[PDB]
Design a protein around this nucleic acid. Structure first.
Lengths: 488, 488, 163, 163
RNA sequence: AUUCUCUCAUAGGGAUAACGGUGUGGCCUUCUACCUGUUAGAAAUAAUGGGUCUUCAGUUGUAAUUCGUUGCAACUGACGGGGGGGUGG
RNA sequence: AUUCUCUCAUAGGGAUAACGGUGUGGCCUUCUACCUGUUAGAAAUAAUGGGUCUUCAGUUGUAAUUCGUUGCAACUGACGGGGGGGUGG
């Protein structure tokens, strides 16, 4: 297995994945344009197939060109690596505004450089996994971050008093001396081969100061620079998790957290660049009071973790509500708020196709398209597997029955109100349908009626319920673990 | 995927693996009997194909019977698990005398029982891996234990002082209350399903007190039982590794190790059964002295770990020497020490087939059969892969050049001495061959001459060298890591 | 507040403590303890001749841990006050109480934590000037009668005059 | 060994402690303490009715410091044994005794520091299997009579028979 | 029978001689520096049968250098134990 | 051309119209309780078209119990928010 062949495989697979994503993109755009034509009649916008902008900034950002000459690209890249002249091309960089008021600088390398980064840094991460910390993640959407969440959740439930602190390593990785990184190349038993050292130094030379974030090389370089910080914090006895440029350190002792602060200060000095907290707080039961500046629940990556339970962050709940509400609005109000309702099927005969589309969109967003019979079979034992898709799949650890119950009520209420507005708008256009099925049900009846309704022998009016899929998620976590339900 | 089909697959694969092992066993016995006939002439003992004794203790210890009726066995086992009546059959237990003066009680479950154990407890270990400690191994031959060794080695090299201590958990696992085990079922975020809880309780009910050691269920039950000990030792800041029924805890501070002792006893009292150290020492540089009872180098699973290097334990070196010396003795002395040399080829024409067989046996034992050209090709870059088999594969972390150099000298000296004795015996039998090639070389020439000798275009006389394969092993560790070189 | 702890403490935990901390409990005494407990089902009777002994026997490990930490404490009825001169010590005391709570099967809840300083000087953590401890307002400057107790005194004197 | 501490402890230090640790000493009691001290010149008389009180009054801050550390201790006559489950705690106790020796103007010397473990298990620091405390050989496995006391018993029995 | 097939199947029934593997060599194909006869051949190479080194450390010169280091010479420094009995420096 | 093929190949040459995907339905097959017409049929079922619940907690009875708990009834306790304006208890 020669290096050129390896680069060839990697570059081709990356290009093919990007090509497949673009093909599925335009196919989705077409299917959605057909449905939107059916929804908005003659007012429906026309299709507009876009291609990513960065594809044109360099021809090697474009998957199709890279697939055109991936053999020559691999040939030349391998020769440059063997002759130790390879240097990655500048990546695409867009500065996004972090909500905290900071700036996250994403870097999209070209397909060749991304392929090389994966080929070498995945190998390095696998070869040195046991030298790294437990809860170290390069993205804040990594499926394994939930393990860290689980840990803190468990601690919060068991500990009385869980002193937490948070730290922003954004500037640390924005400007960390590459000489410090190089000093760590031969420490903590890290197995880095000479060619791997050349590739690390090349990707760093392409940059000038700091580690690129949100890339294949971010996790390894971050672990390599912070290995002594991890060792010191583990010797202290505090538990910590680094997700992207965020670090949470928790302990059952105040002295331990203070000593952890001292450790971060020392590490900041040894690195030449400072690390700043977002700072130090105590997490306790809701009833019991606190000494120091304290909060009842920490907010960690879409979770509100409390000593009593794990729930969805209010921002994430707002996002869920936004999507459900817009599903209903798009399918049941927006079309009727256009200047002309030409080409738009007006509901009649006790059938509203728009309401079916909206309920099915909400079901896809929530359950992933599951029926309540499927979920009840899983919950009962009749069926031994239930795929876990939808929004709840991203919150596998929620154990807040009250929150899900409140969202159930909110879904039913918003369905009622949107249907009532749809009836009012329809009546303005001159189509009285209040007596018909989708506009006659009272709120306290919607679920029931929609449960009994059947079309094609399948109940596709049932109002999706967060709590049923929460039961299923809990059973699936106790039967398969986190890793097996966040991806099939 | 129904449970009966899963049990069928698991039982059938276990049975087939055992059958394949027995087929290879008798094939190896025949090939070796042919070679031994050639070696010992008419005195060659006759073949004796044995079948494992436990195959007859119960028909289900027998791979062939289980393969005969694995469908019925799986059917009934699945029915018994669904009806929650399954109870594993008694395993074969042999009491082996531990060198420390203790007793290790092995347990060989029947093929159905072992298959069920693997099916469920591999799932529980995978589903709960992140809840378990880092360096926890069920066997003392587990390939991953070297990671623990690496950690301690790194620590020993870096730390000014490394306090270490050792503990015997043999009695803990011999008699741990199954009620304590059950109390741990719902702690530390362990995801244990109801059927998994039934299988755990069934395998425990088959036993009465304690966890079976050296089994598919050992690692999980040990981790579940010792989760609070691991949490307390991690909160203190000491590092530890449990291999089988042994636990090593090391720290850079004396106070930390003392507090670790305290933790082990709090755990011992809470478990109802005591854990006794083998006990505590300080590891420092060879030149520097110590205040507390101390040793220069710890012995950890075939390694003598010192602050200056990692070497092979003198017991392991003795084993290597025993095997090499017996290779030479079997092929070059034992046949000539028989009553009659009938049917034994006497060396002549400057050719000793016995010496070639012996040198090749040593090469297989050490290198795995590699040529020095293969090793040098790997060391140079000409070849990008060198398989790592032999005895050195089991000591991937050795970095003691002096030990390997001394073993090189010992190999050459023993080759010379055994050849001299072979010449003397041959002359007693009346075959003067001192002037011939295999018996004329001086010790300080053997290597050189044998390096130049060639047969079939391949240098099959070269005296195998530990230091060459050590160079290759170091390069392969820096290029592929421990996991990729201890198994291909 | 140890009210729930004495309301429902497993009698098996109590029995586990019978042979610890050098307690000299004779067999007939063990029978009388077990009989008075059997009359109950869960928990120790509070405000009785057996309350003090059973509470001390059941909390002996909590007392030992709190004394090893270095905090000083007093248990009066189903109330426990723990004071120290260090914040870290009191935090570790909270941790100790909960290790004990988990080991006992029933939880102990604070009433919770404060800092007592001179009246003039400020505080960093949530603080009060004077604690109220059993009819006493204890301050860093003096010991006085609790305002509730002063109200009771005033009530009695005023009713004497009124009557 | 607090022998020299009580042989020569400044009576001014003793007097400084008269109004500390909530000690209730009446004026006449202070006169009697000062009179028995004035008869002496330096130190506390040992083996007397006044020895315990004066010793407790001089060493009250040492006791408080050792209790805050979390070590357990016992003073019998001019002997003090301090034991703990942690090496750091005993070292910090040594530091406390050192500070107290300075605050008193006279030094306290160990007999010094050891670890008591099971007979089978080994030790780090200079260690012994069993401590000898007042006619007892205390071990982790049992409490026995000191070999000197056993010799005394044997001497008496043997002389009974001889006589 | 360890093969094939039936029984509400951790056990029992049948029917056929097969099933399952091992060493050697062959092709396929993964990676493999240089010098050579002698077979083909118009110097493009292929199968063959003989041979050499191939690693690590330091010094110095040179080129790059984001000042962590990196490519190339070219010089020496290791690169096959220990013990017993005699014996020379 | 995003296909196919050549250049000591992160770039350039050519030659052909194809390549890469998407929704629906079909078969294959993975797992899926019960009650039913009406089609086949001799009660063995299959495709079809309609319907019901399926979870968790406690109490009690019962059986096992290595004293952690486990199978079965059968009774109730939850099992679809919040807010604004009026209005009754």
């Amino acid at each position: 297995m020669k290096l050129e062949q390896q680069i060839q495989r990697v570059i081709l697979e990356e290009a093919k994945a990007l090509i497949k994503d673009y093909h599925e993109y335009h196919n989705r755009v077409h299917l959605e344009s057909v449905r939107n034509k059916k929804r908005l009649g003659d007012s429906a916008p026309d299709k507009k197939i876009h291609r990513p902008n960065y594809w044109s900034f360099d021809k090697k950002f474009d998957p199709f060109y890279v697939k055109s000459n991936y053999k020559s690209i691999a040939r030349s890249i391998a020769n440059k690596i063997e002759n130790r002249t390879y240097l990655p091309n500048e990546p695409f960089t867009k500065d996004v505004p972090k909500p905290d008021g900071g700036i996250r600088k994403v870097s999209i390398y070209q397909i060749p450089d991304a392929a090389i980064s994966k080929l070498f840094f995945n190998r390095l991460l696998a070869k040195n996994r046991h030298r790294f910390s437990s809860f170290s993640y390069a993205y804040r959407n990594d499926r394994n971050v939930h393990f860290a969440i689980q840990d803190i959740s468990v601690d919060l439930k068991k500990n009385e008093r869980t002193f937490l602190a948070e730290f922003d390593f954004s500037d640390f990785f924005g400007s960390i001396s590459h000489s410090f990184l190089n000093e760590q190349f031969n420490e903590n038993g890290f197995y880095i081969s000479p060619e791997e050292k050349f590739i690390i130094r090349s990707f760093l030379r392409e940059r000038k100061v700091g580690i690129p974030q949100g890339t294949s090389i971010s996790l390894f370089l971050a672990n390599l620079t912070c290995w002594k910080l991890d060792q010191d914090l583990e010797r202290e006895g505090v538990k910590f998790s680094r997700y992207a440029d965020d670090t949470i350190i928790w302990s059952q002792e105040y002295s331990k957290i203070c000593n952890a602060f001292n450790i971060i200060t020392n590490f900041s000095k040894s690195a030449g660049i400072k690390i700043n907290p977002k700072g130090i707080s105590l997490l306790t039961k809701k009833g019991l009071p606190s000494e120091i500046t304290s909060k009842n629940n920490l907010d960690f990556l879409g979770y509100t973790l409390s000593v009593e339970n794990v729930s969805i962050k209010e921002k994430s709940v707002k996002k869920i509500k936004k999507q459900i509400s817009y599903i209903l609005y798009r399918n049941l109000i927006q079309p009727l708020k256009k200047t002309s309702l030409a080409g738009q099927t007006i509901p009649a005969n006790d059938r509203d196709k728009n309401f079916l589309i909206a309920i099915c969109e909400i079901r896809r967003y929530m359950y992933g398209g599951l029926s309540k019979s499927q979920i009840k079979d899983y919950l009962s034992g009749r069926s031994n597997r239930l795929y876990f898709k939808g929004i709840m799949s991203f919150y596998p650890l929620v154990n807040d029955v009250e929150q899900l119950k409140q969202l159930d009520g909110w879904i039913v209420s918003v369905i009622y109100r949107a249907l009532k507005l749809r009836c009012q708008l329809l009546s303005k256009w001159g189509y009285n349908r209040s007596h018909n099925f989708p506009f006659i049900l009272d709120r306290e009846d919607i679920v029931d009626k929609c449960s009994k309704k059947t079309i094609a022998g399948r109940k596709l009016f049932e109002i999706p319920s967060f709590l049923l899929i929460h039961k299923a998620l809990q059973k699936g976590l106790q039967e398969s673990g986190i890793e097996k339900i966040m991806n099939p």
